[PDB]
Scaffold this active site. Structure first.
Site, PDB file in Angstrom:
ATOM      1  N   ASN A   1       0.872  -1.170   0.000  1.00 20.78           N
ATOM      2  CA  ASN A   1       0.000   0.000   0.000  1.00 20.78           C
ATOM      3  C   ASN A   1       0.914   1.226   0.000  1.00 20.78           C
ATOM      4  O   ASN A   1       1.432   1.586   1.052  1.00 20.78           O
ATOM      5  CB  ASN A   1      -0.925  -0.011   1.220  1.00 20.78           C
ATOM      6  CG  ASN A   1      -1.858   1.179   1.198  1.00 20.78           C
ATOM      7  OD1 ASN A   1      -1.928   1.947   0.236  1.00 20.78           O
ATOM      8  ND2 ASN A   1      -2.592   1.340   2.275  1.00 20.78           N
TER       9      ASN A   1
ATOM     10  N   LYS B   1       0.035   4.217  -0.312  1.00 20.34           N
ATOM     11  CA  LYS B   1      -0.680   5.357   0.234  1.00 20.34           C
ATOM     12  C   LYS B   1      -0.541   6.533  -0.706  1.00 20.34           C
ATOM     13  O   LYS B   1      -0.613   6.373  -1.916  1.00 20.34           O
ATOM     14  CB  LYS B   1      -0.277   5.581   1.686  1.00 20.34           C
ATOM     15  CG  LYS B   1      -0.495   4.340   2.538  1.00 20.34           C
ATOM     16  CD  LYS B   1      -0.345   4.621   3.992  1.00 20.34           C
ATOM     17  CE  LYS B   1      -0.475   3.368   4.824  1.00 20.34           C
ATOM     18  NZ  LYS B   1      -0.392   3.690   6.275  1.00 20.34           N
TER      19      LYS B   1
ATOM     20  N   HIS C   1      -9.778   0.754   4.402  1.00 20.59           N
ATOM     21  CA  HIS C   1      -8.553   1.088   5.118  1.00 20.59           C
ATOM     22  C   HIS C   1      -8.846   2.021   6.292  1.00 20.59           C
ATOM     23  O   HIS C   1      -9.671   2.919   6.171  1.00 20.59           O
ATOM     24  CB  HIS C   1      -7.522   1.731   4.163  1.00 20.59           C
ATOM     25  CG  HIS C   1      -6.177   1.789   4.737  1.00 20.59           C
ATOM     26  ND1 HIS C   1      -5.760   2.753   5.618  1.00 20.59           N
ATOM     27  CD2 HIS C   1      -5.190   0.893   4.611  1.00 20.59           C
ATOM     28  CE1 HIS C   1      -4.510   2.434   5.988  1.00 20.59           C
ATOM     29  NE2 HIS C   1      -4.116   1.345   5.378  1.00 20.59           N
TER      30      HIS C   1
ATOM     31  N   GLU D   1      -5.843  -4.545  10.654  1.00 21.43           N
ATOM     32  CA  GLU D   1      -5.007  -3.403  11.029  1.00 21.43           C
ATOM     33  C   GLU D   1      -5.123  -3.125  12.525  1.00 21.43           C
ATOM     34  O   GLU D   1      -6.184  -2.717  13.005  1.00 21.43           O
ATOM     35  CB  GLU D   1      -5.519  -2.167  10.320  1.00 21.43           C
ATOM     36  CG  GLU D   1      -5.405  -2.215   8.802  1.00 21.43           C
ATOM     37  CD  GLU D   1      -5.794  -0.889   8.192  1.00 21.43           C
ATOM     38  OE1 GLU D   1      -6.983  -0.683   7.944  1.00 21.43           O
ATOM     39  OE2 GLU D   1      -4.956   0.046   8.209  1.00 21.43           O
TER      40      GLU D   1
END
Ligand SMILES: [As]
Ligand SMILES: [As]
Lengths: 244, 244
Positions: free
Chosen positions: B10, B12, B94, B166
């Protein structure tokens, strides 16, 4: 008298590879014979193909939104990323983001300041809802939105700012559009300065078609268009030609 | 025993043209000698360059977010747009979007269902905050989040789902990670079915480094990683190799 017009295409969340190739070829073949800045704002994932296939130097590519900072912001695209990619225009404060994606007046104002300080040309969007217009609050609302933006900008920033009035309450006659544009310009003139006000482009962001574009551009305080659905069609060229 | 591992990067809201070219060349040269699905999720505007420069067929390109429908959603990218571009993976839910961008459990659940029904592989993210963990609500929270997703999916959809835990409260020991992964898998086994549960990939989405990856992958209920900052570095290859 009027400053250089802008005709900006907001493709929103629309397009395919095939449809964009076809549309960009039509824009590339269009011979524009007057001084107008054209802008195309594709969805983020279409920015590279548009940058590659566009060859008409009268166009700039814009983003449809951005955040100020790179970092741990999954799903977002930042202003430094756009600059590295060669994008120097951004639309901020679009009514759909203010409505659906939590962009308050303060959030928009801060993004505009961040885009100013990173060198962008900014199309900053303002406009009142149906409930606000019915309450006779058009002027309160569009001038509050503009004031929030202005409070974070120095006077010299206005060379990088473009305002776009969206009649959210409709999305309007050319007369109703002109009344709001004139109000916006008179407020800028008083608060910010008359030289800033006469050079500022205030674009109309309601429903713009080949049918109505020339009638709107005849209005003294309209400096072009932020176009939605018609910008996905070959008649976008007729909207550009309406700013002659 | 374990299903095929996944190692997902990821990125981002990070990268430049130059940095991505360099990183993708390192990933292309890495010879992977075991069965692992690698995924790279760049920012939207970097998807095309990554699609072009990647040549390692063990990788798929992912989006970091999407909306379900094309249309008048300025600034967003839709699932039909991604499919036309050849992207068939998406990260949904996310923690940064749940926290900063208004994605509630219901919003995430609906996006996952929409991505399922449009043919995507989905990395669906769940995880509890520090306040929730301190309240001894880890299980309530991650199973509420997962249940919300599950309620909109038929049993056959789970071949397209990947969960990523997460530990938002940290962003954790490998033992703490394993406890949550085991809880998630046991709930899926009971509610959905044991065949779905044994095939489901549950990826760890806390801080994953070259230093800790093998220790995490030794845990029986961890099926790989959703990697943040280390995925921007050549040591991502060491994280892939930790899933052997
Ligand atoms: As040309
Ligand atoms: As290769």
């Amino acid at each position: 008298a009027k400053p250089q017009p802008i005709v900006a295409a907001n493709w929103k969340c629309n397009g395919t590879t095939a449809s964009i190739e076809k549309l960009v070829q039509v824009l590339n073949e269009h011979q524009i014979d007057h001084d107008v800045q054209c802008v195309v704002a594709p969805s983020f994932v279409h920015i590279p193909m548009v940058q590659a296939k566009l060859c008409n130097p009268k166009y700039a590519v814009s983003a449809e939104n951005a955040i100020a900072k790179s970092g741990a912001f999954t799903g977002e695209v930042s202003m430094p990323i756009l600059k590295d990619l060669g994008v120097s225009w951004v639309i901020l404060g679009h009514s759909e983001r203010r409505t659906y994606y939590g962009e308050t007046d303060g959030v928009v104002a801060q993004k505009v300041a961040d885009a100013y300080n990173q060198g962008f040309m900014v199309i900053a969007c303002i406009g009142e809802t149906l409930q606000q217009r019915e309450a006779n609050q058009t002027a309160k609302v569009v001038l509050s939105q503009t004031a929030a933006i202005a409070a974070k900008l120095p006077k010299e920033a206005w060379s990088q700012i473009v305002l776009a009035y969206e009649p959210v309450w409709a999305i309007a006659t050319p007369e109703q559009a002109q009344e709001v544009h004139a109000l916006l310009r008179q407020w800028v003139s008083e608060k910010i300065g008359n030289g800033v006000a006469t050079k500022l482009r205030i674009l109309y962001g309601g429903s713009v078609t080949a049918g109505n574009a020339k009638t709107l551009y005849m209005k003294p305080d309209i400096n072009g268009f932020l176009v939605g659905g018609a910008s996905l069609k070959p008649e976008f060229r007729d909207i550009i030609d309406a700013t002659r």
